[PDB]
Design an enzyme around this catalytic site. Structure first.
Site, PDB file in Angstrom:
ATOM      1  CG  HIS F  17     -13.209 -52.555 -47.152  1.00 59.64           C
ATOM      2  ND1 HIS F  17     -13.046 -53.493 -46.151  1.00 59.64           N
ATOM      3  CD2 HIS F  17     -11.958 -52.179 -47.519  1.00 59.64           C
ATOM      4  CE1 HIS F  17     -11.757 -53.678 -45.926  1.00 59.64           C
ATOM      5  NE2 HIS F  17     -11.075 -52.891 -46.741  1.00 59.64           N
ATOM      6  CE  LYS F  21     -15.467 -48.242 -53.668  1.00 59.56           C
ATOM      7  NZ  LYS F  21     -14.651 -49.162 -52.806  1.00 59.56           N
ATOM      8  N   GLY F  44      -9.387 -44.368 -55.985  1.00 60.76           N
ATOM      9  CA  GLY F  44     -10.014 -44.102 -57.274  1.00 60.76           C
ATOM     10  C   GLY F  44     -11.515 -44.300 -57.310  1.00 60.76           C
ATOM     11  CB  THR F  45     -13.726 -47.246 -56.903  1.00 61.70           C
ATOM     12  OG1 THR F  45     -12.722 -48.047 -57.558  1.00 61.70           O
ATOM     13  CG2 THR F  45     -15.101 -47.578 -57.502  1.00 61.70           C
ATOM     14  CB  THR F  46     -13.763 -44.265 -52.435  1.00 67.86           C
ATOM     15  OG1 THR F  46     -13.865 -45.619 -51.974  1.00 67.86           O
ATOM     16  CG2 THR F  46     -14.372 -43.320 -51.385  1.00 67.86           C
ATOM     17  CB  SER F  63      -8.465 -48.836 -57.657  1.00 69.47           C
ATOM     18  OG  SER F  63      -9.295 -49.662 -56.855  1.00 69.47           O
ATOM     19  N   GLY F  64      -7.591 -48.529 -54.508  1.00 67.97           N
ATOM     20  CA  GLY F  64      -6.922 -49.034 -53.330  1.00 67.97           C
ATOM     21  C   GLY F  64      -6.027 -50.248 -53.528  1.00 67.97           C
ATOM     22  CG  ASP F  69      -5.128 -49.695 -49.976  1.00 72.49           C
ATOM     23  OD1 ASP F  69      -6.067 -48.912 -50.244  1.00 72.49           O
ATOM     24  OD2 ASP F  69      -5.285 -50.906 -49.708  1.00 72.49           O
ATOM     25  CG  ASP F  89     -17.690 -55.235 -45.237  1.00 71.41           C
ATOM     26  OD1 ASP F  89     -18.221 -55.580 -44.151  1.00 71.41           O
ATOM     27  OD2 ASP F  89     -18.083 -55.628 -46.355  1.00 71.41           O
ATOM     28  CG  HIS F  96     -11.667 -56.372 -54.855  1.00 72.96           C
ATOM     29  ND1 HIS F  96     -12.624 -57.025 -55.600  1.00 72.96           N
ATOM     30  CD2 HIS F  96     -12.301 -55.336 -54.252  1.00 72.96           C
ATOM     31  CE1 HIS F  96     -13.790 -56.424 -55.440  1.00 72.96           C
ATOM     32  NE2 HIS F  96     -13.621 -55.396 -54.626  1.00 72.96           N
ATOM     33  CG  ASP F  99      -3.665 -55.255 -45.661  1.00 76.58           C
ATOM     34  OD1 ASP F  99      -4.424 -55.812 -44.838  1.00 76.58           O
ATOM     35  OD2 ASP F  99      -2.420 -55.252 -45.552  1.00 76.58           O
ATOM     36  NE  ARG F 105       2.785 -51.180 -39.077  1.00 77.45           N
ATOM     37  CZ  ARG F 105       3.790 -50.402 -39.472  1.00 77.45           C
ATOM     38  NH1 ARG F 105       3.889 -50.037 -40.746  1.00 77.45           N
ATOM     39  NH2 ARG F 105       4.697 -49.988 -38.594  1.00 77.45           N
TER      40      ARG F 105
END
Lengths: 152, 152, 151, 152, 151, 152
Positions: F17, F21, F44-46, F63-64, F69, F89, F96, F99, F105
């Site tokens: 999150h 990061k 993507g961002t991570t 990106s998640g 995700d 977090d 955004h 999830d 899960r």
């Protein structure tokens, strides 16, 4: 099927989401005479704010989202808190605000008087049961505790 | 900021999750003398059960999960319901049981006296405000209604 | 069981805050087709459509103040035939209309519903927009007569 | 700001919760001639039931709650699925039924035509856009992708 | 800001109903290693472990009756060092322990936590099981001193 | 009933999150020597942050919240990812942010080793299983896949 007796002198939990904290402080101030006859407990930030703004003595647990929610919930389940006043924010609840459902559900589990806004709080505080014992009916959870556990 | 007056004779909504319906029926039965002074309204199945088991007159809207939740919520927002008794099930709530958060959130929006269990309901019903006017402080939503709308 | 959507539709228009301008632009682009129908909206969305476009829209309360439930009641009472709900999948705000509860009632009653402008474009282009449409609806008689447990 | 063009021949995802699977099969049967003009893909059980009951060819990913939801979501994000027919259960959704919110939020992210009931699906399938290109407006996510990342 | 887990750990053991037998089998398989530590469990899970294995486990209340919060309180109070929580991703029941609320508090306090047996195996095989471990705890000082809105 | 074998060289997903990061980058930096022996993949961002700040090679998906995700979830379900490090977090998760529930899960469905904070990640990374094969027991879903489908 079973009973929980609320004692004459109550332990009252006081919790507010951030955007309702000033509303709760104002409610405590208007009801200071009645509330200070009882044992008052609060999450960390709400309780510090009541003490700083009003000088009203309130026991404090940790901040709600840091574990204070679970500390108060533990005390509810252990019959150490009798009344819950929780001003939660239905419009601007923040990412860190105490989780509403998880907190309220345990009060329902143990049939605890609980207010989520100041009108309910006013009705509760004006009840004669504030100053007497009150016998709360609870579900018999013995059947649940002895439930059959699946093989897989 | 703004103030709403609850009338002396209340309109009371009665709602129960399936595993709490019998509990609500017994609660209505034991308080029938006090309750029949007020206007009673209920979701479809809960209201039908009260009428059939007790012979107590209750206006019925649709079944909760078919829209009755929203019908009662509309009436709460329109200040046509003064008190909400909602016995929800914290242990065995079914897939079709009325959504707890969305229902009680609207009561909090309009500072409606609301009970989620019989202990809260007993405190509410024993309050002197039950049979007199009550002035409820309503949050000011004028700032929200005039909020800036983002460009994207 | 069967429900019949009438020739002239009642169309609900609702947008999350970050989608309100998109919804206004969508109404503007489809104004000729839409004003043949009865338009209703939550308070802020409807106010914005009327002020920005001069298009007539009946307004209920703001969504999170009860407008969601007012429109939901009309959906359940089959007084709304089509729901256009532009919700925000990225920056939905604490006060934005709750997505699941609003759309679950359309599914309960098999109401045509769009959650984005592509679906809304497909719905509005259907010949069923301007004719009657017979929709199959779930049978709830068994649910209404269900056994109530003892505890 | 940006545009995503749907091709003339669409790829259509077909997904149903357990209590809506027979409804979805009946819907596919009713529209079989139209649907077989397109590329059909489904979660594992739904696709199995369609092929077995109707003899209609459907590519199958894993079962929804075992990862099939994410496989279809991946293809939606990768522009490999153009239309989504998702009959979910608003009344009796089971513990294992595909998570509704997570699946449909990604369709909204990419402005995917999506039906959650047969009335919406009928309106979608009757659109002239079924058989032509369709230009879908999408948000420009470049600003989001270049967002400031907080230090803590 | 560093929290020190002691050499002898306090390990919480919790399972959803359809995962209880899996947790019992896992505890059985690692009994020699686990009984070197202080074991604590929700009411039914701990009862099952003691009845099935004769392994001593301190028991709090049943999870959904308050046991979740009792263990959460102990986590927040740094009285539990490791959490093994076998939750059910397919058939979780109405009364099963709230997954999000339970594991969120472990993340708040950077508690080693397993949600399935593979993670539990990796955790139990760590050399940190039997030594001290220095855990970095997030700084909540800014949050605790945050400004409170006027309304 | 069934067994999944993690290979000695792992494929490790790295996800954070936004407010976590920097924490995840610092954690990757402290464990770079051990981690670069494995196949690293990230949203993507991570992933861009890890590559740019640390010079550590990470395959990047979308990106998640834009589908990343689901791309990682698909790979989890297809047994192409062996370990998941997901710093989410618990205090300031943004609208955004990925999830949490849907992501973790699916790791539980397939009994994937997973860390949600740096202490769990440290325990996982210190395990002797990091560099050897590991046999994970997985639930048998054959009965679930062959379940009877209700008629209504």
């Amino acid at each position: 099927k079973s009973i929980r007796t609320l004692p004459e002198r109550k332990t009252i939990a006081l919790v507010a989401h951030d955007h309702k904290k000033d509303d709760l402080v104002r409610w405590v101030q208007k009801h200071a005479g009645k509330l200070t006859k009882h044992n008052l407990i609060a999450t960390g930030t709400t309780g510090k704010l009541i003490e700083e703004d009003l000088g009203v003595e309130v026991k404090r647990v940790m901040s709600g989202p840091l574990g204070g929610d679970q500390q108060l919930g533990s005390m509810i389940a252990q019959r150490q808190i009798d009344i819950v006043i929780f001003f939660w924010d239905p419009m601007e609840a923040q990412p860190h605000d105490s989780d509403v459902k998880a907190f309220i559900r345990l009060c329902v589990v143990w049939n605890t008087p609980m207010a989520c806004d100041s009108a309910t709080a006013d009705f509760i505080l004006s009840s004669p049961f504030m100053e007497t014992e009150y016998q709360a009916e609870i579900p018999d959870y013995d059947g649940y505790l002895k439930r059959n556990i699946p093989e897989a």
